[PDB]
């Protein structure tokens, strides 16, 4: 029997007071968008309680911010499942129409579910964000879209990516940065250029991004075995490239998690010496995101049901 | 050069009211930067290094950055030499450039170097040179400026996968897809990102990201990409059917003669210049000194680039002798 | 008394009466007011109605902080040039965040508490923005005393310039972005268009207060004295200046609308709420 | 001008003002100084002129701004000339009432009178700063000038009632009575760069700026003490303030100013080490600007006929 290692995290575990209402509202939005073809797919999303992830990762934001962020999470889950998760060339050639919409240079066709929804989200983000904040978000979305071609490339040649390549690319394949980009926007504040881009702030963002990607890899491993051999998963990557048992691969992912937490706490102590209020709120945002994501992933029907009944949990 | 049309082509004029200037350090820095490129071992062939020497890449750096001090010009000239060498050897090359999956899978080691997360291998000429340039930019730029440059480089690298995607299935991109992607496949934004750095100043978040500044930057980027497409068309017929070229795209998708394709590129250039002058008038009403300096930077870049493209051995020699110039 | 037309929205913070009571209790606890009659006058004045009408969008905690600051200003206004100038360095020391205040000055103790509470919800740049406006307001008081000391009515040009800083309006404009939980960047705040709108709004509030409250430091008196006008003609010229400033505000706002970021738009709506809310409170 | 022997009847020892900051001078010092002195002559602000010439104001500009290009040094040199002339040339009530016309010129709401030498010059300098600075940078400078002008009323208030100000009041007010902040406001402008709001206003950067401002004011007070004895009993001078309020001999007051100097240097180095952990390149250039200002000011003041000449012949120099 497999033992899932614990994912210790000293960060506060909180949830937005608007979780229940906004989750239902954002799910209804997703259903109305026609981004998902199957009624069964719509129901699987509903059961996953995507709005619980939104509320746990953004526990401080006002209701209208949570709703906007929840709609964005729903777009990403839908897009990730429907577009991304065969042939790198076909998928690369599909991107420019979407990039046109993202740059606001073209009206989507009436039949383009993903384009119509992305246009609406860009407009709604633009209503509550500065041009710098909008571009910050847009840049992260573009990197995410192009990162999906890299996943398609690995599937096309039927290779498990190497640890070095995977850990680098996992930071942008997961879209976590596109959600970090809405922390200040969601809270109604705005980090200045040298606040946002400060090496300490970037380092904490990168470690938070690693933690969320790796934590999802550990907990989503079981359901990913059912889809292209869990190719894009640190458990599969370490098992394959270090010739580990599944149990030892799970433990190595837990080790990398613990080491990233240690690295986060160290850099945070340095940042604490100089950080302004806006930077402190953003870093607390990263902490809520990492901890809220673990709470969500351990409890979501998206991940839990795929684990065999005899799997042990900490 | 062998003629590729039934009757001589007339290269249309590329009118531009922007000042045409050259950095006073052009001659000395061109030679210094070329020596740096040769010393880097990024280019394997002596013949390749010689064709780069003949192209006078430092003339492009000096014309596009005419105001910057010598140390700035040298750094920017080294960056242009990196881009020319990399674009020719990697992006448009036989091994990586003809399959989306191969090019995509080759990027992560380079991205690692770009993020300052890894020492290049002693034999990785492109990686060692990129690490050196990252460090030299970091010496004279704020973290926001370095990240801005790094972001434009990542956008450029990812964009190359799309070019490879087109080569792989042997298709000419449609006009709408090509004009969108041509703004990021050409690395022009990575050079715009060094205008404030080069001049010793720094646009703040809302200056850089202001819709008016982004619009002028996008129009400048269009002009440079299309102007390069017009003048590099002849040399590009010799590699991959000039697939990534507005002339090929319009000729193919609108069923135009090459002469009519060239004229439609010139019309698009004239439209972009008119759009630039219109948006510049709006920006003039609010622009701070740093924003005005950056926009003058865009104007110098567009005009200096036309002068380079009309005069560089990289482009001129591939045109048949019966080609009429503007 | 001529009308003061104003196309800016008239709104009130829903927390007006709850926070007015809380803030008045805070003022009574501060001992900044000596007389029981003065404390009762302040209670009945509903200073929190001015705070709520001039800051109608801010959350309750922001309204409470701003209401306490208005109470500090009104108390400080209620309580010669040389004496005034020499009284400032101890307030400045508290303001600088350089030393804890003595039990000795009620104004110092409360100013320190407000600085701490502003620092808790503002960036260092925002705190320094507010500090600068408070210093200018304090130094501006000396100028008023200078005129009183030699029994002079100030000239129109001197009065209109100094009236912008004698009234402390800029100290309240400095808490608009803070109160709303956002922050204008240096080049947003200091853009000539944003400074011009800030200055026109400050002009309007000062001139509106002068006219509605109508003595030596009053635009009606200044114009009547220096332009040899009847009281009625002085009142009308003040109303004309008001209408000209409103017109100037709308035209400059139209120019700003071309380029303004969302934070700048929110701030400018803040100026509009302040001008209109001030008139609503005064009437 | 001065005495052979001490006004105390014992030779006075001027304590050293130790400082590990590099002493540098702008390569354009001599040329720009002459040009700036010409400018001042042409302004008609001086009606004094010969002592300024001998004082070599341009040497202070060049020592305090050693890295800036020639055009920046010239602008800064003209501004120093404006300040030295104004401090010399300029009752609390009369002084307070003289400020608004100057404030109007500063805020562009008024043209100066054809006869207003100081207003005409201030207008020209504002426009020349505006030519090479962002609106935020111009407002930074404008704000420090206003604070400087208002601070002169506090000096007039003490003079009017004949009070020596207390150490706590004087030390606070000395940071704005001296106009030092108006010169710090041109460090980034002079260098062709610009600190962001949260760079400029960071507590570490404000602390270093305030300590640098303290150092320059106290160092000037120590070295200008003899000259200021001949002007309103050296009322506005830390030596007078400490001697009066802490019941010190003048010799012990000089030594206490040097102790405060050494304490401020130590505090600067400690805070600079903390700032080193986060500082961006523009912040590092500005902080190096503060160091050059403090050190260049000591070099200038110790060698200046403006200060050295007033001390008795038996004074013991460091
Ligand atoms: C893009 C997306 C799916 C969701 C958006 C919300 C989000 C950033 C969640 C954090 C978890 C992880 C990085 C999601 C993407 O990985 P992966 O594709 O392995 O997600 P899965 O394990 O749920 O399938
Ligand atoms: C990236 C590079 C090659 C040069 C760096 C300098 C630069 C941004 C030049 C502007 C011209 C054009 C956008 C070059 C890339 O396209 P293309 O591959 O069509 O250039 P080519 O026509 O010279 O081959
Ligand atoms: C304002 C002025 C005089 C010059 C501008 C240059 C400047 C800021 C010099 C630093 C030294 C000191 C603060 C001068 C003002 O004090 P004080 O009036 O005691 O100077 P003094 O000792 O030269 O008379
Ligand atoms: Mg997925
Ligand atoms: Mg995925
Ligand atoms: Mg997963
Ligand atoms: Mg290319
Ligand atoms: Mg090429
Ligand atoms: Mg080309
Ligand atoms: Mg003085
Ligand atoms: Mg002195
Ligand atoms: Na700010
Ligand atoms: Na000011
Ligand atoms: Na700025």
PDB file of C-alpha atoms in Angstrom, chain D residues 26 99 114 142 144 196 204 216 283 296 306 310:
ATOM      1  CA  UNK D  26      33.889  67.306 -10.633  1.00  0.00           C
ATOM      2  CA  UNK D  99       6.930  84.530   0.986  1.00  0.00           C
ATOM      3  CA  UNK D 114      11.019  93.171 -14.011  1.00  0.00           C
ATOM      4  CA  UNK D 142       9.742  72.638  -5.336  1.00  0.00           C
ATOM      5  CA  UNK D 144      12.041  71.237  -0.411  1.00  0.00           C
ATOM      6  CA  UNK D 196      10.641  55.787  -7.965  1.00  0.00           C
ATOM      7  CA  UNK D 204      16.234  53.413   4.913  1.00  0.00           C
ATOM      8  CA  UNK D 216      26.135  68.801   6.711  1.00  0.00           C
ATOM      9  CA  UNK D 283      19.095  53.944  -4.972  1.00  0.00           C
ATOM     10  CA  UNK D 296      32.792  67.210  -0.349  1.00  0.00           C
ATOM     11  CA  UNK D 306      34.151  81.891   4.054  1.00  0.00           C
ATOM     12  CA  UNK D 310      36.833  84.323  10.996  1.00  0.00           C
TER      13      UNK D 310
END
